[PDB]
Design a protein around this ligand. Structure first.
Ligand SMILES: Oc1cccc(Cl)c1
Ligand SMILES: Oc1cccc(Cl)c1
Ligand SMILES: [Zn+2]
Ligand SMILES: [Zn+2]
Lengths: 202, 201
């Protein structure tokens, strides 16, 4: 009943248990335990730095988001930009990663304007960071954030960068993101700009 | 309709508008294969083949061992084998590989185990080819770790598997044999040891 706005995404998702395949369009997916991701995060933290691991998860996110945008934009072009755009927050929820709540969204491909202010509820990534590292000094939703940048940059024609302003792992009540184009942030690896940015803010 | 996997499927709840997927009390993610692709490339160049192979067997091991935890108490009025089959069934459910049984016998009590399985549609084989191309050896490291983690848990002893054929080498399907440590021709600290056994093959 309650899937009017996501059904077109769901119709692309095909479970084939008997042949060991899950498909989103012509792309295989895997059902995985969030706790195995936390294990992976920690083992990567141990082998490489905090920085390399961070950067691993952002670049991964970034590819996943770009890939999903490739898929979700080939279809849904009878709609206006905002309804089209919303596939990305919908895919994040459909994949089990985070619930997106929109505070603000303004965008125009042709004006090269973008500004997003979303809340992130029940982020899996924050959960597993607390589980492996305990309370954090910095925002923890690295993979989710690269996905946001990747999805959003593909859909716009340009580098959109997000910042996680509040994070459940830091003890905030929910997580929160803000997305603008690169140069709107005063003052390839766009993962270095995301990482560099979070240091310049406080 | 048509399922001997329904007791497993029942436990999976998708809740997309709260951003959640569940298996029993445990939370899950539908992921891209790209993450594992990257991990595999990144580690190949940062760490070399041997360390990248072990890392993947280790991650598969931990997952297999976690499915075995969750599925353990679930089939008491079925025999040891029909219960064990959760592992192979879960692998298929999760979009990883399809398991066709050639042979399977096991006794916990007699400490006996032989498994000969075909692996069809291995996501891992596909990811190896698309990043490194043809292998010279079996490449389904994660899948193999899982087999070892799950089976070793259930049998309460070290079960090691050999991938005898692999789509990554140009064979038409992947194949594995699992037996106990002993039968081969030669908590946490024990997993590291088990993972190292199943890497020297
Ligand atoms: O969760 C998010 C946030 C912004 C954009 C997208 Cl595509 C997903
Ligand atoms: O795919 C497999 C193969 C053997 C055991 C398990 Cl639990 C899964
Ligand atoms: Zn967060
Ligand atoms: Zn293989």
């Amino acid at each position: 009943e309650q899937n009017k706005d996501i059904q077109d995404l769901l119709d692309k998702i095909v479970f084939d248990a008997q042949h060991g395949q899950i498909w989103f369009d012509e792309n295989r997916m895997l059902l995985m335990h969030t706790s195995i991701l936390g294990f992976l995060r920690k083992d990567l933290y141990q082998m490489l730095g905090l920085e390399r691991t961070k950067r691993f998860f952002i670049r991964c996110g970034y590819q996943a988001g770009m890939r999903d945008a490739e898929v979700t934009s080939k279809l849904r072009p009878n709609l206006n930009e905002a309804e089209a755009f919303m596939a990305g927050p919908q895919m994040h929820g459909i994949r089990g990663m985070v619930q997106v709540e929109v505070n603000e969204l303004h965008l125009s491909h042709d004006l090269k304007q973008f500004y997003a202010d979303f809340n992130w509820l029940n982020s899996f990534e924050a959960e597993v960071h607390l589980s492996e590292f305990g309370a954090s000094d910095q925002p923890a939703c690295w993979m989710l954030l690269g996905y946001a940048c990747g999805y959003s940059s593909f859909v716009m024609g340009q580098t959109i960068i997000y910042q996680e302003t509040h994070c459940v792992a830091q003890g905030d009540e929910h997580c929160r993101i803000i997305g603008k184009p690169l140069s709107e942030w005063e003052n390839d690896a766009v993962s270095d700009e995301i990482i560099a940015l979070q240091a310049e803010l406080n």
